[PDB]
């Protein structure tokens, strides 16, 4: 059985779908991963995973979409429709023939391409059910971007997904999030990268509307991009248990030079070891001599790391994160408590769930997040009794996540059900 997979062209969408693809390949499915030219330029390792990679034109890549998201997302959609159609037509000249297309839930219009080509369509949601619920209510018109929503904790305005941050892209971004539910009744399979025990009531409510399959964490060939694995893991192996602050703001968020200074000073004025992912295009905003000298005694500043392996390392005491869903889920499944510094979109909501529902992190308070506030949060997690509580809570969630992906677990059962439906 041949499965096609089409993530949105950004690492937080590619990676969870790649991990699901690796699970399905291990069950005997053939996988073809559809990437844009722009994504493929960053791909450095792919031989080992045995997945075919097929590229399509960019169609307009994230840096160009930011210049005008309303126009360029629509251009990206039109090219993706045309070019995935042409690619599927070519794949139909080869055995085994494609049978199903798993596509990012942010591109619901790919369902039409799947069905026009005689394929089953599976929408893959890369955000938890709790946050996806908000997008559904936005589409229904129940909410527009104190707030009560069914089966969610009471929210402050700042806990709703952040679209105002995008300024002239705000309305375009809000419409694309709500559009994820625009054809959900016509989808053949609805997949969520979450596990039931993490959000029992909202999953149960969602399941009362559509048959959904919770298949997360899809994370366990694990990386496509340069991760600097050797340098990162040898440095971590030099650290004692529970001593390293891991710091990352993900693949897209960028902090101003002013904000980077406060982070840098806060890490230095703490006396903790730290591994800080500062992407290559963001390095020039670090303080003058930070990467080359002042970070050398206690820090490793790196442009990308093997995040799953880092979070699994016993040296890591806590994760200062922007609260993207992959980073949130990977930390929870690793048992790593968090310092929440959300930037925009669903990160604000994830931070509220981390702090107040799952209780595995603390949130920073904006004044810019000043260095004293970051230092206080580090102290809360590394030293305080509250931090020991957050760690115990994280280990409890790690155990439930391990339950979910092991035989008899909810996510294992759902991946088996999806696989058997295809057979």
Ligand X SMILES: O=c1ccn([C@@H]2O[C@H](COP(=O)(O)OP(=O)(O)O)[C@@H](O)[C@H]2O)c(=O)[nH]1
Ligand Y SMILES: C[C@]12CC[C@H](O)C[C@H]1CC[C@@H]1[C@@H]2CC[C@]2(C)[C@@H](c3ccc(=O)oc3)CC[C@]12O
Residue 65 makes contact with ligand Y by CB under 6 A: yes
* Pairing, β 189-192 against β 30-36: unpaired
Residues in contact with 202: Cβ distance below 8 Å, sequence separation at least 6, in sequence order: 129, 130, 133, 150, 151, 152
Q: Select from 25, 43, 61, 62 the one that contacts ligand Y (CB under 6 A).
A: 62
**Closest approach of ligand X to the CB of residue 421, in Å:** 27
Cβ nearer to ligand Y, comparing 173 with 405: 173
Q: Select from 304, 358, 397, 418 the one that contacts ligand X (CB under 6 A).
A: 304
Largest CA distance in the chain: 62
**Closest approach of ligand X to the CB of residue 95, in Å:** 33
Residue 248 binds: one of ligand X, ligand Y, none (C-beta under 5 to 8 A by kind): ligand X
Cβ nearer to ligand Y, comparing 180 with 334: 180
Residue 326 makes contact with ligand X by CB under 6 A: yes
Cβ nearer to ligand X, comparing 250 with 299: 250
Q: How many CB atoms lie within 10 A of CB 236?
A: 22
Give the binding-site size for ligand Y (rule: CB under 6 A): 15
Q: Which residue is nearest to ligand Y (CB)?
A: 106
Burial 104-116 (b: 16+ CB within 10 A, else e): bbbbbebbebbee
Residue 327 makes contact with ligand X by CB under 6 A: yes
Residue 166 makes contact with ligand Y by CB under 6 A: yes
Cβ proximity of 50 and 25 under 8 Å:
yes
Residue 277 makes contact with ligand X by CB under 6 A: yes
Residues linked to residue 103 through DSSP beta bridges, in sequence order: 6, 123
Residue 191 makes contact with ligand Y by CB under 6 A: no
Is omega for the bond preceding 396 within 30 degrees of 0, making it cis?
no
Residue 345 makes contact with ligand Y by CB under 6 A: yes
Looking at 4-12, 60-68, 191-199, 238-246, which segment touches ligand X (CB under 6 A)?
4-12
> How far apart, in Å, do the first and last CA atoms of the chain sit?
7
**Closest approach of ligand X to the CB of residue 125, in Å:** 12
197-256: contacts with ligand X (CB under 6 A) = 248, 250-253
**Closest approach of ligand X to the CB of residue 193, in Å:** 10
Cβ nearer to ligand Y, comparing 49 with 180: 180
**Closest approach of ligand Y to the CB of residue 345, in Å:** 5
Residue 11 binds: one of ligand X, ligand Y, none (C-beta under 5 to 8 A by kind): ligand X
**Angle 288-291-293 (CA atoms, 0-180°, nearest 5)?**
85
Residues in contact with 323: Cβ distance below 8 Å, sequence separation at least 6, in sequence order: 338, 340, 341, 342, 347, 348, 350, 351, 354
Cβ nearer to ligand Y, comparing 65 with 202: 65
Q: Build a one-symbol-per-residue string for 276-305: x at contacts with ligand Y by CB under 6 A, - elsewhere.
A: ------------------------------
Output the six-digit token pair for 62. Answer: 């994230």
**Closest approach of ligand Y to the CB of residue 113, in Å:** 17
Residue 252 makes contact with ligand Y by CB under 6 A: yes
Q: How many CB atoms lie within 10 A of CB 251?
A: 21
Q: Select from 5, 15, 263, 301 the one that contacts ligand X (CB under 6 A).
A: 15
Is omega for the bond preceding 96 within 30 degrees of 0, making it cis?
yes
User: In whole angstroms, what is the distance from residue 327 CA to residue 322 CA?
Assistant: 8
User: In whole angstroms, what is the distance from residue 375 CA to residue 269 CA?
Assistant: 7
Output the six-digit token pair for 290. Answer: 């930070």
Is omega for the bond preceding 363 within 30 degrees of 0, making it cis?
no
Cβ proximity of 255 and 266 under 8 Å:
no
User: In whole angstroms, what is the distance from residue 404 CA to residue 412 CA?
Assistant: 6
User: In whole angstroms, what is the distance from residue 179 CA to residue 181 CA?
Assistant: 5
Q: Which residues bind ligand Y (CB under 6 A)?
A: 8, 10, 62, 65-66, 69, 106, 166, 169, 173, 176-177, 180, 252, 345
Q: Which residues bind ligand X (CB under 6 A)?
A: 10-12, 15, 248, 250-253, 277, 304-305, 307, 324-327, 330
């Amino acid at each position: 059985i041949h499965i096609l997979a089409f993530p949105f062209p950004a690492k937080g969408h590619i990676n969870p779908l790649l991990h699901l693809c690796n699970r399905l390949a291990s069950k005997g499915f053939k996988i073809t991963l559809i990437t844009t030219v722009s994504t493929l330029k960053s791909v450095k390792t792919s031989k080992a995973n045995g997945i075919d990679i097929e590229s399509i034109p960019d169609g307009i890549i994230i840096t160009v979409m930011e210049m005008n998201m309303e126009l360029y997302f629509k251009q990206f959609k039109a090219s993706a429709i045309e070019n995935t159609t042409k690619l599927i037509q070519k794949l139909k000249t080869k055995n085994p023939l494609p049978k199903v297309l798993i596509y990012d839930s942010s591109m619901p219009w790919i369902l039409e391409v799947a069905h026009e080509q005689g394929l089953l369509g599976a929408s893959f949601f890369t955000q938890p059910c709790s946050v996806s619920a908000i997008y559904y209510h936005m589409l229904q018109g129940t909410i527009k971007l104190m707030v009560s929503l069914p089966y969610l904790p009471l929210l402050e305005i700042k806990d709703l997904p952040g679209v105002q941050q995008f300024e002239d892209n705000s309305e375009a971004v809000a419409e694309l999030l709500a559009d994820q539910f625009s054809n959900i009744d016509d989808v053949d399979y609805v997949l969520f990268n979450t596990f039931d025990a993490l959000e029992i009531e909202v999953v149960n409510w969602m399941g009362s509307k559509w048959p959904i399959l919770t298949v997360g964490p899809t994370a366990p060939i694990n990386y496509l991009f340069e991760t600097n694995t050797e340098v990162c893991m040898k440095w971590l192996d030099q650290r004692e248990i529970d001593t390293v602050i891991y710091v990352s703001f993900g693949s897209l968020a960028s902090l101003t030079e002013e904000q980077m200074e406060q982070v840098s000073q806060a890490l230095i004025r703490s006396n903790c070891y730290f591994l800080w992912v500062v992407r290559e295009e963001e390095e020039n905003k670090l303080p003058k001599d930070f990467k080359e000298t002042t970070s050398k005694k206690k820090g490793l500043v790196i442009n990308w790391c093997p995040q799953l392996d880092v979070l699994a390392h016993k040296s890591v005491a806590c994760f200062m994160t922007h609260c993207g869903w992959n980073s949130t889920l990977e930390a929870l499944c690793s048992g790593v408590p968090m310092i929440c510094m959300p930037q925009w979109a669903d990160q604000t909501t994830n931070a509220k769930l981390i702090e107040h529902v799952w209780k595995i992190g603390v949130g920073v308070n904006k004044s810019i997040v000043k260095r004293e506030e970051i230092e206080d949060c580090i102290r809360q997690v590394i030293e305080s009794e509250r931090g020991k509580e957050l760690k115990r809570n994280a280990i409890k969630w790690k155990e439930l996540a391990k339950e979910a992906v092991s035989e008899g677990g909810s996510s294992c059962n759902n991946i088996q059900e999806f696989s058997s439906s295809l057979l």
